[PDB]
């Protein structure tokens, strides 16, 4: 109200409204799902078009051979944060000959977002990210909020109508965690999860975007006729 003019101002109840408004941009974004087993980790994303002449906005970005994310909210902010992750993954490989741990990648994203919430002149990031990866401790899934809060999960969803997919994953928890050594079935579970968030529209060949990373599987993105198999 009187306390939402900038990020440097607490409200009388201890809230940061500019950060909360940045969180609101994620809720307007298109739905994206993340889930994992013990061998693989999967991202599923519903892409959004402007109209029938337009392309469908890409949602998934590769960060390294073993790591990548999906976005929901301001796309240019995801480009800035994914570029930072690419650099950090790269610094780890060049200096230490070491693949960057997914947990450490989450810590770095948290700290970068935090600086934009405590200083004058700047603004919070307006995007939410789901980071998947396979490192020395197996498969991982992370959820990033521009408040700075990063959380490690078995599965989750962000964007508009993400609550339906999140409840489905909460039911299916015991089933999909056991899908080891079967990439197709894990993606099926992710496609079935994101379907619980659809209304009026359904999953078409240029609508659906899928990404997977695992034990002997580099981070790869599937679009176009490559996802017709799962429709």
């Amino acid at each position: 109200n009187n306390y939402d003019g900038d990020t440097v101002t607490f409200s009388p109840t201890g809230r940061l409204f500019q950060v909360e408004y940045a969180l609101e941009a994620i809720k307007q974004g298109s739905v994206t799902v993340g889930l994992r087993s013990n061998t693989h980790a999967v991202l599923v994303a519903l892409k959004r078009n402007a109209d029938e002449l337009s392309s469908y906005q890409k949602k998934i970005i590769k960060c390294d051979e073993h790591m990548g994310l999906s976005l929901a909210g301001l796309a240019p902010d995801a480009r800035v944060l994914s570029n930072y992750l690419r650099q950090q993954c790269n610094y780890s490989s060049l200096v230490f000959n070491r693949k960057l741990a997914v947990e450490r990648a989450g810590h770095l994203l948290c700290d970068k977002a935090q600086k934009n919430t405590q200083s004058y002149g700047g603004r919070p990031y307006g995007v939410g990210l789901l980071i998947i990866g396979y490192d020395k401790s197996g498969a991982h899934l992370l959820e990033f909020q521009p408040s700075g809060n990063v959380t490690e999960l078995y599965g989750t969803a962000i964007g508009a109508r993400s609550q339906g997919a999140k409840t489905y994953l909460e039911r299916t928890l015991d089933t999909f965690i056991k899908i080891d050594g079967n990439p197709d079935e894990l993606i099926k579970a992710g496609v079935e999860a994101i379907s619980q968030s659809l209304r009026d529209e359904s999953l078409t060949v240029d609508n659906l975007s899928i990404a997977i990373v695992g034990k002997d599987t580099p981070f790869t993105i599937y679009d176009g006729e490559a996802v017709a198999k799962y429709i």
């Binding site: 408004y21 969180l23 906005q57 301001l74 240019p76």
Partner: protein, 235 residues
């Protein structure tokens, strides 16, 4: 007052949303992509008859394989064009090749959100970037001051955009010829323009693989306008 980088309660940046309103006041620009090429057309909109209309430059070359049309506060486009030209030429210097149309568009869009308290405000102009490369063929992109860019089969920007876009929705198909696209841009420009369309208040251009980016002569466009008039009178 309030920050230039402030979010609204709906999760939108005030300044970006306000710049979009300035673009709505701009003159119309239309692009249509075909398998034979991409066509770009603009409304010149001279403020007075004493203004020499061929000095109005709203269609611009970025490289031989990439063209661009603008709508809104057109003075703001000059540094964006400069950056685009530099990025295209620099990549050719570094890699001995043409730059991808998407990559050029992404480089231009990286400038967009570099404002705060860097430049003092967002750009008040939208761009239609059209071109060809070997990997993805003929392409048309819409670059906004939000930093977002969408690829389009056809797109209109400016004051007559929503009426024009509805028209493009009906007319575009995947088998359009270059000639058919030229007439289609002229037809829709004529529909949304205030003044009567002729070769002096409207301008056409195209990008083909063979000949590259070309701005059409007033004599060449005048013939296409006459061809349009006759085929509309044909039924």
């Amino acid at each position: 007052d309030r920050g230039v980088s402030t979010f609204s309660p709906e999760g939108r940046l005030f300044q970006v949303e306000y710049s979009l309103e300035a673009i709505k006041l701009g003159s119309t620009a239309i692009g249509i992509a075909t398998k034979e090429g991409v066509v770009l057309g603009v409304e010149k909109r001279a403020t007075s008859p004493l203004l020499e209309s061929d000095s109005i430059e709203k269609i611009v070359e970025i490289d031989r394989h990439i063209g661009c049309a603008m709508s809104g506060l057109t003075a703001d486009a000059r540094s964006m064009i400069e950056h685009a030209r530099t990025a295209a030429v620099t990549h050719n210097l570094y890699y001995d090749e043409d730059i991808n149309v998407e990559s050029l568009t992404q480089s231009v869009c990286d400038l967009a959100l570099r404002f705060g308290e860097l430049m003092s405000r967002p750009f008040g102009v939208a761009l239609l970037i059209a071109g060809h490369d070997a990997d993805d063929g003929y392409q048309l992109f819409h670059a906004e001051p939000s930093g977002t860019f969408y690829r389009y089969n056809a797109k209109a920007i400016g004051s007559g955009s929503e009426g024009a876009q509805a028209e493009l929705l009906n007319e575009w198909h995947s088998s359009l010829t270059l000639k058919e696209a030229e007439l289609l841009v002229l037809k829709i420009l004529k529909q949304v323009m205030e003044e009567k369309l002729d070769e002096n208040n409207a301008q056409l251009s195209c990008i083909t693989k063979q000949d590259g980016f070309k701005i059409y002569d007033n004599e060449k466009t005048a013939e296409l306008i006459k061809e349009l008039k006759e085929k509309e009178a044909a039924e």
